[PDB]
mmCIF file of C-alpha atoms and ligand atoms in Angstrom:
data_model
loop_
_atom_site.group_PDB
_atom_site.id
_atom_site.type_symbol
_atom_site.label_atom_id
_atom_site.label_comp_id
_atom_site.label_asym_id
_atom_site.label_seq_id
_atom_site.Cartn_x
_atom_site.Cartn_y
_atom_site.Cartn_z
ATOM 1 C CA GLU A 1 0.000 0.000 0.000
ATOM 2 C CA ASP A 2 3.025 2.283 0.542
ATOM 3 C CA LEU A 3 3.737 4.416 -2.584
ATOM 4 C CA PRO A 4 6.893 3.843 -4.671
ATOM 5 C CA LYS A 5 10.104 5.498 -3.523
ATOM 6 C CA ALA A 6 11.617 8.200 -5.723
ATOM 7 C CA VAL A 7 14.063 7.186 -8.474
ATOM 8 C CA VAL A 8 17.151 9.069 -9.672
ATOM 9 C CA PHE A 9 18.096 9.011 -13.376
ATOM 10 C CA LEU A 10 21.091 10.571 -15.163
ATOM 11 C CA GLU A 11 20.853 12.363 -18.506
ATOM 12 C CA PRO A 12 22.930 11.473 -20.439
ATOM 13 C CA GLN A 13 23.078 7.966 -18.920
ATOM 14 C CA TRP A 14 26.869 7.768 -18.366
ATOM 15 C CA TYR A 15 27.653 7.049 -14.706
ATOM 16 C CA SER A 16 31.251 8.201 -15.250
ATOM 17 C CA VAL A 17 32.035 11.594 -16.757
ATOM 18 C CA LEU A 18 34.987 13.866 -17.261
ATOM 19 C CA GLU A 19 35.492 17.163 -15.464
ATOM 20 C CA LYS A 20 33.721 19.989 -17.373
ATOM 21 C CA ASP A 21 31.060 17.591 -18.647
ATOM 22 C CA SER A 22 27.418 18.540 -17.985
ATOM 23 C CA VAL A 23 25.185 16.056 -16.144
ATOM 24 C CA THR A 24 21.472 16.353 -15.386
ATOM 25 C CA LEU A 25 20.178 14.419 -12.363
ATOM 26 C CA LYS A 26 16.410 13.793 -12.740
ATOM 27 C CA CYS A 27 14.063 12.759 -9.951
ATOM 28 C CA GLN A 28 11.118 10.575 -10.802
ATOM 29 C CA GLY A 29 8.496 11.104 -8.087
ATOM 30 C CA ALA A 30 4.996 12.331 -7.179
ATOM 31 C CA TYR A 31 3.918 15.573 -5.502
ATOM 32 C CA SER A 32 0.959 16.568 -3.352
ATOM 33 C CA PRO A 33 -1.146 19.608 -4.341
ATOM 34 C CA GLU A 34 0.379 21.766 -1.593
ATOM 35 C CA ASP A 35 4.004 20.690 -1.810
ATOM 36 C CA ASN A 36 5.818 19.930 -5.053
ATOM 37 C CA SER A 37 9.312 20.525 -3.686
ATOM 38 C CA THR A 38 12.054 17.947 -4.418
ATOM 39 C CA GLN A 39 14.959 17.327 -2.145
ATOM 40 C CA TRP A 40 18.347 16.334 -3.600
ATOM 41 C CA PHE A 41 21.189 14.764 -1.632
ATOM 42 C CA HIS A 42 24.883 14.344 -2.495
ATOM 43 C CA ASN A 43 26.427 11.766 -0.106
ATOM 44 C CA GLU A 44 23.912 12.523 2.683
ATOM 45 C CA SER A 45 24.304 16.294 2.271
ATOM 46 C CA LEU A 46 21.234 18.266 1.226
ATOM 47 C CA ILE A 47 22.015 20.207 -2.009
ATOM 48 C CA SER A 48 18.622 21.400 -3.333
ATOM 49 C CA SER A 49 15.111 21.661 -1.975
ATOM 50 C CA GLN A 50 12.667 22.442 -4.740
ATOM 51 C CA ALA A 51 13.320 21.648 -8.458
ATOM 52 C CA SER A 52 12.797 18.093 -9.736
ATOM 53 C CA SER A 53 16.124 18.103 -11.620
ATOM 54 C CA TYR A 54 19.593 19.069 -10.424
ATOM 55 C CA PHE A 55 21.807 20.315 -13.280
ATOM 56 C CA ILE A 56 25.625 20.144 -13.027
ATOM 57 C CA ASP A 57 26.894 22.532 -15.676
ATOM 58 C CA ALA A 58 30.575 21.660 -15.425
ATOM 59 C CA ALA A 59 31.388 18.589 -13.347
ATOM 60 C CA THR A 60 34.273 18.528 -10.931
ATOM 61 C CA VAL A 61 35.844 15.569 -9.124
ATOM 62 C CA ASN A 62 34.192 16.876 -5.950
ATOM 63 C CA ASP A 63 30.811 16.095 -7.574
ATOM 64 C CA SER A 64 31.656 12.347 -7.500
ATOM 65 C CA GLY A 65 29.579 10.228 -5.159
ATOM 66 C CA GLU A 66 26.077 9.039 -4.357
ATOM 67 C CA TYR A 67 23.017 11.020 -5.265
ATOM 68 C CA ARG A 68 19.501 10.527 -3.939
ATOM 69 C CA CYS A 69 16.257 12.432 -4.242
ATOM 70 C CA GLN A 70 12.821 12.427 -2.612
ATOM 71 C CA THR A 71 9.498 14.292 -2.840
ATOM 72 C CA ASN A 72 6.791 14.642 -0.179
ATOM 73 C CA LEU A 73 4.945 11.611 -1.626
ATOM 74 C CA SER A 74 7.866 9.492 -2.921
ATOM 75 C CA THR A 75 10.336 8.379 -0.307
ATOM 76 C CA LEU A 76 14.133 8.594 -0.355
ATOM 77 C CA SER A 77 15.453 7.007 -3.585
ATOM 78 C CA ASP A 78 18.086 4.310 -3.768
ATOM 79 C CA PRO A 79 21.449 6.011 -4.482
ATOM 80 C CA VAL A 80 22.906 6.503 -7.948
ATOM 81 C CA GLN A 81 26.700 6.779 -8.282
ATOM 82 C CA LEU A 82 28.417 9.460 -10.382
ATOM 83 C CA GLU A 83 32.176 9.201 -10.975
ATOM 84 C CA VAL A 84 34.069 12.242 -12.253
ATOM 85 C CA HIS A 85 37.453 11.663 -13.920
ATOM 86 C CA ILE A 86 40.328 13.782 -15.206
ATOM 87 C CA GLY A 87 41.999 12.772 -18.483
ATOM 88 C CA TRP A 88 41.890 13.224 -22.225
ATOM 89 C CA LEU A 89 39.518 10.286 -22.801
ATOM 90 C CA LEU A 90 36.989 8.294 -20.813
ATOM 91 C CA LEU A 91 35.323 4.996 -21.842
ATOM 92 C CA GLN A 92 31.630 5.444 -20.919
ATOM 93 C CA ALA A 93 28.856 2.885 -20.543
ATOM 94 C CA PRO A 94 25.417 3.198 -18.977
ATOM 95 C CA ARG A 95 26.448 0.650 -16.285
ATOM 96 C CA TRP A 96 29.123 -2.010 -15.752
ATOM 97 C CA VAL A 97 26.926 -5.110 -15.363
ATOM 98 C CA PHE A 98 24.728 -6.390 -18.187
ATOM 99 C CA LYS A 99 22.493 -9.449 -18.681
ATOM 100 C CA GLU A 100 23.001 -11.733 -21.693
ATOM 101 C CA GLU A 101 20.936 -10.428 -24.660
ATOM 102 C CA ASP A 102 21.324 -6.828 -23.411
ATOM 103 C CA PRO A 103 22.623 -4.205 -25.815
ATOM 104 C CA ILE A 104 25.897 -2.547 -24.679
ATOM 105 C CA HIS A 105 26.506 1.088 -25.727
ATOM 106 C CA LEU A 106 30.098 2.233 -25.175
ATOM 107 C CA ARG A 107 31.360 5.726 -25.900
ATOM 108 C CA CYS A 108 34.990 6.900 -26.109
ATOM 109 C CA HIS A 109 34.440 10.362 -24.709
ATOM 110 C CA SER A 110 37.038 13.059 -25.281
ATOM 111 C CA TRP A 111 37.612 15.979 -22.919
ATOM 112 C CA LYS A 112 35.681 19.236 -23.526
ATOM 113 C CA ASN A 113 36.648 21.032 -26.770
ATOM 114 C CA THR A 114 39.059 18.309 -27.894
ATOM 115 C CA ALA A 115 38.442 15.935 -30.792
ATOM 116 C CA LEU A 116 39.567 12.345 -31.057
ATOM 117 C CA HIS A 117 40.437 10.502 -34.305
ATOM 118 C CA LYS A 118 41.614 6.959 -35.209
ATOM 119 C CA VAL A 119 39.799 5.439 -32.271
ATOM 120 C CA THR A 120 39.987 1.763 -31.242
ATOM 121 C CA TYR A 121 37.846 0.102 -28.558
ATOM 122 C CA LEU A 122 39.642 -2.854 -26.987
ATOM 123 C CA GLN A 123 38.528 -5.766 -24.875
ATOM 124 C CA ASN A 124 41.047 -7.749 -22.833
ATOM 125 C CA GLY A 125 43.859 -6.176 -24.829
ATOM 126 C CA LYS A 126 42.395 -7.006 -28.269
ATOM 127 C CA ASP A 127 40.874 -4.662 -30.855
ATOM 128 C CA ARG A 128 37.036 -4.856 -30.981
ATOM 129 C CA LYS A 129 36.249 -1.848 -33.231
ATOM 130 C CA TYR A 130 38.034 0.940 -35.107
ATOM 131 C CA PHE A 131 36.650 4.305 -36.308
ATOM 132 C CA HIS A 132 38.543 6.877 -38.348
ATOM 133 C CA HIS A 133 36.540 9.632 -36.587
ATOM 134 C CA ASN A 134 35.216 9.227 -33.073
ATOM 135 C CA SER A 135 31.994 7.200 -32.996
ATOM 136 C CA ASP A 136 30.263 5.038 -30.412
ATOM 137 C CA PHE A 137 30.593 1.269 -30.258
ATOM 138 C CA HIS A 138 27.335 -0.639 -29.903
ATOM 139 C CA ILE A 139 27.455 -4.358 -29.106
ATOM 140 C CA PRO A 140 24.071 -5.694 -30.351
ATOM 141 C CA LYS A 141 23.401 -8.527 -27.909
ATOM 142 C CA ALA A 142 25.707 -9.252 -25.024
ATOM 143 C CA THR A 143 27.066 -12.791 -24.664
ATOM 144 C CA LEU A 144 29.274 -14.083 -21.861
ATOM 145 C CA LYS A 145 32.224 -13.570 -24.214
ATOM 146 C CA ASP A 146 31.686 -9.814 -23.740
ATOM 147 C CA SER A 147 32.837 -9.816 -20.094
ATOM 148 C CA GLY A 148 36.220 -8.252 -19.682
ATOM 149 C CA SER A 149 38.408 -5.188 -19.390
ATOM 150 C CA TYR A 150 37.603 -2.473 -21.919
ATOM 151 C CA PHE A 151 39.317 0.763 -22.868
ATOM 152 C CA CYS A 152 39.663 3.005 -25.853
ATOM 153 C CA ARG A 153 42.448 5.004 -27.395
ATOM 154 C CA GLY A 154 43.112 7.336 -30.261
ATOM 155 C CA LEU A 155 44.707 10.577 -31.331
ATOM 156 C CA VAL A 156 43.939 14.137 -30.238
ATOM 157 C CA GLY A 157 46.048 16.305 -32.491
ATOM 158 C CA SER A 158 49.310 14.356 -32.653
ATOM 159 C CA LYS A 159 49.082 13.095 -29.052
ATOM 160 C CA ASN A 160 48.289 9.374 -28.550
ATOM 161 C CA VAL A 161 45.916 9.038 -25.604
ATOM 162 C CA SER A 162 44.267 6.053 -23.892
ATOM 163 C CA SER A 163 41.361 5.862 -21.454
ATOM 164 C CA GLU A 164 41.401 4.054 -18.145
ATOM 165 C CA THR A 165 39.938 0.521 -18.230
ATOM 166 C CA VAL A 166 36.365 -0.381 -17.350
ATOM 167 C CA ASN A 167 35.503 -3.936 -16.215
ATOM 168 C CA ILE A 168 32.260 -5.246 -17.659
ATOM 169 C CA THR A 169 30.407 -8.252 -16.250
ATOM 170 C CA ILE A 170 27.725 -10.153 -18.108
ATOM 171 C CA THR A 171 25.355 -12.136 -15.927
ATOM 172 C CA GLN A 172 23.505 -15.155 -17.259
ATOM 173 C CA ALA A 173 19.688 -15.533 -17.351
HETATM 174 HG HG1 HG B 201 27.949 18.514 -3.009
HETATM 175 HG HG1 HG B 202 22.227 4.097 -25.348
#
């Protein structure tokens, strides 16, 4: 009989971002006629008390952590993690655990106002996909063979750069 708790969503979906990236935290919840305020929390600290969304214009490493929201009808949400990194490239995914059959969208994100070319996405040290100009790598339907350590690399100007690795787990069922 108890109403659903609030839910936090990130737009875009990437849980890890680079400093200077913009992130919008959205709160899915219900409001009563006399109180439509939304409360946002960053690691247990209150950060906002009215708007349904919390917009981070230019992320900093200090923004990393757990975020939760709530309304006066939808209770405290489970936490959503945001990781903020510093580097020329970042391999992004909407999550790090996928079920077999699931599509996997990876993005080799370059730092604000830089452009990457000759990009390769690698899995367990082996090339999985190459693009002459930076593009995303979509794995149609995940199999157990997709579990592993992923990273991407390419060129920004004449500088060879490589992202940190991201470990992806595929669960059965
Ligand atoms: Hg904060
Ligand atoms: Hg996607």
